[PDB]
Amino acid sequence: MCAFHAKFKEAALFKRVVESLKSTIDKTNFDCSDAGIAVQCMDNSHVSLVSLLIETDAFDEFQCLKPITLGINLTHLSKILKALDNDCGLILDVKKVDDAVLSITSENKTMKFGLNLVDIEAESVEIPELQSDAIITLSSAEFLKITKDFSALGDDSITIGCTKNEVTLTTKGAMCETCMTLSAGLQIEHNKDVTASFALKQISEFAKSAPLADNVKLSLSGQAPLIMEFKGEACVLKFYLAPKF
Amino acid sequence: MCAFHAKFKEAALFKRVVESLKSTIDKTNFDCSDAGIAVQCMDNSHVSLVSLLIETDAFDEFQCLKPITLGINLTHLSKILKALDNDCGLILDVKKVDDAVLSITSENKTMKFGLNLVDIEAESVEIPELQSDAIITLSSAEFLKITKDFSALGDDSITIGCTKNEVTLTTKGAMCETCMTLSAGLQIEHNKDVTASFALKQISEFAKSAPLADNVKLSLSGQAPLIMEFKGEACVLKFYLAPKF
């Protein structure tokens, strides 16, 4: 009997998950259980927090009787996933504790990969407590564009401000001071004006998770970590980043 | 009161201007006045002449009461312009003599950039006197293709010859002798047969200005500098290059 078996409803979902993930962390544990697939760990720089939950509703078949944790090198997994089509039937299998995750594409073709698992020795982490001043919702693709321009024209920080009707995004580089202003497409749930600065490298790497969801949700606080959430079908991805001062 | 204010009819125009420009010169003065925006200077190699004139008809709004000269690093300006859409409403502002040109994109979005101006110490230049033997008009995109193939297959020179009904373009490389022949699409205003050789690096860099205009106009003389003109809507770009011997 297999310790773990899972077939996705959509192969695109897990490919997109792994891209988004691998921009911010290289090796990570996938904690599987009868409740789904989870990832909670710090980014590469030990500066921020990543939180993934794929739910059982994302799969056509799902079996994980007892919890297991798969140590996964995301560079190796994306290389495998890049070989697949969004069309295919993607299946994951773990036989026992023999250290290999079997990925399977079904088509008149079938591809089977044995991915060697890794040993990841990592302290489990806990999300911070928050009560945000404003919650911003915006096209994730437009938000990505912005992070992109900012990386080119900015320095190390990006400032994000929110008022009742407008969001403001600021960076100042060596040869340029930039300011994008959005007015409510864009949704603002506001209860208190708020502005904060963040590491642009993180924001801009986080922003690349756009493929997971049409919109991105930024939960904004002046002193406590921001949340950038990409909620998909039966799946959600979140990043936690503390403001800079 | 602002020393300079300008809003383009089309944002594409100024983006295209700056690309074309920056292929042949890195930093240059933009001389603004109530007559428009002008650039007259030598290329990077001090081998040729660039001549730009954007007229006031290219703008929906234009104010420049007294002449000013903006010292502009084109590498920095293109990076800013690349962030904009051809769609947007592009505005330029100079407050006073505080050394920053404000670019503004209007969309439910607005982007404001402060570009630091530079000090450019350059002798003003004068265009040469000409009376050309033939004036050739041809798709600028087909002319670019040719410069491109020639750069790959040729050496340092390109020869351009004109007769009553045909234009001839020649380069000879280490492993190849190449010859393109065009017959009159292509227009020839001819009064005297003429052939001359030119630095291929220049021609091929000049040719990249194709986006400014559907056709390119080459004014050809045997002993005096060639003209390569890209005339847009209310705008024109010209290069002056002396033949080699």
Add this chain to the structure above:
Amino acid sequence: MCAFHAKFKEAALFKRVVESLKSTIDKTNFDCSDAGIAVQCMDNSHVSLVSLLIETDAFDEFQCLKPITLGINLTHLSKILKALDNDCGLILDVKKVDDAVLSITSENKTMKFGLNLVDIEAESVEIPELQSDAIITLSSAEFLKITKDFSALGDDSITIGCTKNEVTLTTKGAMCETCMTLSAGLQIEHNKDVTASFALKQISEFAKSAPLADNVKLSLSGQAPLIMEFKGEACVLKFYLAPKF
């Protein structure tokens, strides 16, 4: 009188030939005769055999009264051919023994290139004798995709197995064991089950000849060299590769 004159029915044919060729060999002799254009030589690594035959049916005009051999640097020829459109009228000419092959594109444009020929001192080679166990036919583009994924995920070998109804392709890399399985699109002419390993570098370089033909034909034997054939209109390309043990 020209020693050799040829105009292709389709310019795409010779461009595709030269790309496919140049992936496996850099300089080679083109043996022309009244029977067509032929190339028989070992790959760069002196590990495999290339066999090309363009027939006279591939041309609208063809004259080669006496056999000639053109020593051709394929890097230089592809650079020339890349300048042409699939649309154009491609002509080859050799005047005498003056060491230049004239390529000509006819359009209101005409391009003439003189390509310097080379001296290639190579022992003529002979194809091996075969009687294959199975002959597999499959989309050449799907076969290329596979070689591509395998190069990324595999090591130095690829294993190809054939049964009555299924083909099996295996490679095992440092972090991955991969297996694609195809079932009969795909055609199998089978008389004996067969499996063999091959240098993946070769297969994957050979596979890039896909543009020549919709399908690829692999003639498979357990001990004797495999054949990978790309048969076009009036043209055919073949590679011969011995199994590894």
